[PDB]
Amino acid sequence: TNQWYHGKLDRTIAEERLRQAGKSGSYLIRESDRRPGSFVLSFLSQMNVVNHFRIIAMSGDYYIGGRRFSSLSDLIGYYSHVSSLGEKLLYPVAPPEPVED
């Protein structure tokens, strides 16, 4: 569950991880290092374009595209199962597993 949370992660590594997944509709959530306390939905769109959508944390709520959410998980759920953003969240990209010691 919620494999798509990468915590603190810069833009370049986020784009690397999404491009590694390689399919349009791949996504992750990271807490912006440039704007801490805010988050980014990073999303691989068509034609090798990564979009980085700011998500605003306001009043215990989370805002993206004027829609309001109670948790980052609720936000991911909505753009996966209710409506497109219009592109659709399809493949959650999990953080790289720990390496073989």
Author numbering: 178 to 262, 265 to 280
Sentences from the paper on this structure:
p120RasGAP is a multidomain regulator of Ras signaling, containing two SH2 domains at its N-terminus and multiple other domains including a RasGAP. Binding of p190RhoGAP is mediated by phosphotyrosine-SH2 domain interactions, and a major driver is thought to be between the N-terminal SH2 of p120RasGAP and pTyr-1105 of p190RhoGAP. p190RhoGAP recruitment has multiple effects, including inhibition of Rho signaling by locating p190RhoGAP to the plasma membrane, and activation of Ras signaling by suppression of p120RasGAP’s RasGAP activity when it is bound to p190RhoGAP. Therefore, in this study we determine the crystal structures of the N-terminal SH2 domain of p120RasGAP alone, and its complex with a phosphorylated peptide corresponding to residues around and including pTyr-1105 of p190RhoGAP. The SH2 fold consists of a central β-sheet flanked by two α-helices, and both crystal structures reveal that the p120RasGAP N-terminal SH2 domain adopts this fold.
We began by expressing and purifying the N-terminal SH2 domain of p120RasGAP alone, and by obtaining apo crystals of this domain. These crystals diffracted well, and we obtained a 1.75 Å dataset that contains 6 copies per asymmetric unit. Of the 6 copies, chains A and B show significantly lower B-factors and improved electron density compared to the other copies and we have based our analyses on these chains. In our crystal structure of apo p120RasGAP, we observe six copies per asymmetric unit arranged as dimers (chains A/B, C/D, E/F). Superposition of the crystallographic dimers reveals that there are two conformational classes, which can be defined by the conformation of the βG and βE-βF loops. Interestingly, these loops important for specificity determination at the +3 position of the phosphopeptide. We observe that in one class the loops are open and poised for peptide binding, and in the other they are closer and seem to occlude peptide binding. In both classes, the B-factors of βG loop are high, and in the occluded form this loop cannot be built in two of the three copies, however, when the bound phosphopeptide structure is superposed on these conformations the occluded state clashes with His-1109 at peptide position +4, but the poised conformation can accommodate binding. We interpret this to indicate conformational flexibility and sampling of the specificity defining loops in the absence of phosphopeptide binding. In the apo structure, we do not observe a similar orientation of arginines, Arg-231 and Arg-212, we therefore infer the cation-π stack to be induced by peptide binding.
